[PDB]
Ligand binder design. Structure first.
Ligand code: XHI
Lengths: 273, 8
């Protein structure tokens, strides 16, 4: 009984991911988000341990929702005749990182460092859980404004993580790496690192660096805002044209620009209240 | 101008 277990509120957003409503769990007034996905519009399907055929998104969310982390957790899900319904955490108050950057402009590097660090820890958690997000971008990151915590959303273009080549891609083209543009092939970790370079530039410059294929493959990063030399180096490293030239997650987090990160509560108190 | 980019 989904209609008699959650109170359904206003529409929060819609798009390629589906339609998402604000909601409240009747059992305990817990704020939730209710995401509807049309069966007829589902690209990749998966299978649960029960054998039931569910969208890949549900499989991936179950794999990463164990415990606490910087991923929005799947609390429950339901199957309907023509759709699946997902019950997700809802931070309140919340703003997605795309809107946050639109309103604030380029972020101070101390704030970008804290946000970027938290995204790295969240992506590490996904990979440790066998999950590749494949659509890391500011639009798919929520900010819990009171806690200063970032949360990954929209695993609908993701995949099980593997070490062999990927030849399919459903994420955002302007965050996708040049080997995808040129050859329609990529490996998961180095492609993730590329999208993280795009995201970090986005944070410290106020918008993404590339809009067209020729810029993505061209391999030149122009900085439109004042950005420290250490931060420029990290970005350009993540945006290396050759995938094997890109840093690992460990090399990113050991980079000099990443040291002395703020705690999330400090981030909220200094930058978000 | 700054804009969102749909997925897919
Ligand atoms: N796409 C999408 N997944 C969400 C989960 C929670 C909240 Br709040 C908003 C969301 O938007």
């Amino acid at each position: 009984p989904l209609e008699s277990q959650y109170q359904v509120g206003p529409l929060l957003g819609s798009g390629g991911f589906g339609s998402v409503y604000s909601g409240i769990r009747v059992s305990d007034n817990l704020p939730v988000a209710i995401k509807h996905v049309e069966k007829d519009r589902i690209s990749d399907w998966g299978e649960l341990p029960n054998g039931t055929r569910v969208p890949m998104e549900v499989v991936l969310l179950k794999k990463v929702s164990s415990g606490f982390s910087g991923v929005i957790r799947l609390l429950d899900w339901f199957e309907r005749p023509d759709s699946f319904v997902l019950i997700l955490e809802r931070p309140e108050p919340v703003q997605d990182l795309f809107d946050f950057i639109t309103e604030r402009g380029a972020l101070q590097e101390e704030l970008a460092r804290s946000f970027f660090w938290q995204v790295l820890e969240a992506v590490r958690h996904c990979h440790n859980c066998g999950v590749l997000h494949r659509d890391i971008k500011d639009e798919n990151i929520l900010i819990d404004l009171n806690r200063g915590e970032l949360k990954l959303i929209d695993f609908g273009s993701g995949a099980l993580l593997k070490d062999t080549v990927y030849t399919d891609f459903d994420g955002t083209r302007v965050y996708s790496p040049p080997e995808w543009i040129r050859y329609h092939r990529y490996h998961g970790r180095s492609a993730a690192v590329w999208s993280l370079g795009i995201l970090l530039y986005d944070m410290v410059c106020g918008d993404i660096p590339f809009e067209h294929d020729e810029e993505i493959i061209g391999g030149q990063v122009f900085f439109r805002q004042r950005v420290s030399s250490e931060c420029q180096h990290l970005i350009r490293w993540c945006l290396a044209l050759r995938p094997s030239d890109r840093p690992t997650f460990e090399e990113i987090q050991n980079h000099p620009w990443m040291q002395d990160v703020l705690l999330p509560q400090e981030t909220a108190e200094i930058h978000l209240h | 101008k700054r804009r969102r980019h749909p997925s897919g």
